């Protein structure tokens, strides 16, 4: 686990219906909230990969070894049942472990993608802002909405906005 989702971020946005990860800011011009494709997509394209790997086609045919209309002889009947019950124990075991293991990874994967989104925006604003500590960033140069848009699509000049926030 990476510490973002259900970590220092208190919760999520039940109004964010555009993606998994997004930006909700607060500058003078009013209000806005958007979604990030590439983060959302990289989580989508990975959970989707897990599913496509678990839905398969065992070209492995199995035939009747037993008879329900005419019970086979007891000794062989009991060996078969004993054997079938043994294989069932394995598959029930495998299935439960597989799902638990996968779910753990799926969840820590979504955390990862958040923390990866965060700690990249943080690096995009080399010092023109600082970390509040709840997933929010305080700029010290009043960013506009062609500036917030400039961040979201990764352009923001990492220098040409400096002292205006540095000196302050």
């Amino acid at each position: 686990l990476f510490g973002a989702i259900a970590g220092f971020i208190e919760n999520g946005w039940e109004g964010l219906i555009d993606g998994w990860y997004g930006f909700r800011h607060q500058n003078a011009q009013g209000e806005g909230t958007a979604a990030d494709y590439k983060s959302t997509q990289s989580a989508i394209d990975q959970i989707t990969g897990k599913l496509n790997r678990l839905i398969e086609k065992t070209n492995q045919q199995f035939e009747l070894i037993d008879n329900e209309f005419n019970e086979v002889e007891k000794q062989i009947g009991n060996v078969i049942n004993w054997t079938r019950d043994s294989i069932t124990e394995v598959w029930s075991y495998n299935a439960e472990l597989l799902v638990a293991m996968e779910n753990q990874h799926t969840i820590d994967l979504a955390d990862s993608e958040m923390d990866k989104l965060y700690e990249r925006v943080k690096r995009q604003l080399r010092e023109n802002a600082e970390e509040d500590g709840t997933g929010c960033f305080e700029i010290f140069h009043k960013c506009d909405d062609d500036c917030m848009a400039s961040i979201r699509n990764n352009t923001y000049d990492h220098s040409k906005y400096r002292e205006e926030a540095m000196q302050n």
């Binding site: 998994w20 299935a95 439960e96 799902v99």
Partner: protein, 314 residues
Amino acid sequence: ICLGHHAVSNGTKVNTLTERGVEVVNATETVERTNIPRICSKGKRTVDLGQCGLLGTITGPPQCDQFLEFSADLIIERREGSDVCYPGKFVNEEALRQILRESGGIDKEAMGFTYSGIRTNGATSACRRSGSSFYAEMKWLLSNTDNAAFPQMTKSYKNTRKSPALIVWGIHHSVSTAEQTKLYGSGNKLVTVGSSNYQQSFVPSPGARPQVNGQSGRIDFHWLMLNPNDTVTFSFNGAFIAPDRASFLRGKSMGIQSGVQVDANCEGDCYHSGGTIISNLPFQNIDSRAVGKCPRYVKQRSLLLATGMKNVPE
């Protein structure tokens, strides 16, 4: 600027390596619980035996008259089926059944046995057709007269085919030593059978069995697979049911047992007695004895696979 993640009011609880009931945004089922109560047989040469028993297709009681030379990708045994008109049964019946299920059907062929001064049209009211008949692929060999005697015979057949031949003969066990002699004459009767592979021999055993189909006599059915260019010989002297035709397996098939209807409207490859399991899920909790190409049976009813992140509502 601030960043967070999506969420929902209503989440779905999953299990993890560490937790048990963590809510995620979205999960999906991993265990199939859905059954379709028909035999989805779309695209397959299917044979529903109904009242014919799979083993009867070899010997030929009247139920099996239309199944003596069938061809199949999928074979269905029914509960109402019967391998028998005249009461009796097969030795190693299930082994034989398993062979027949994946035979792809059967081709019949004259073994070409000829008989020298005995009777040959043995019959009964248990095998009803026009009147009192017998098994279509067999011959009830009798002493020539209504008591008479049986001349220790010898008949043999060679598999001059490229495939193994299914050979089937019967031993008759009468109500008594009385009837055993009226039919075959007196003396302990002995039948021997061999090949470049096989080794056995048989004696009858008259006596009163309870009445089945209205009869107290029985017929022991026995069988052996002859190899290409191997020969099989029948040293016999009575209490004997002769194979008229031999059987060859057509190719490959699947055999199941069911009590539900057939549907050529749905495609299935995983079958059980109650219908078809159509799923792409890796597992299933419907029938542990499901056959064909199936998801693995598991004891669990449900195992939810996370397809999303933690759902943390406000």
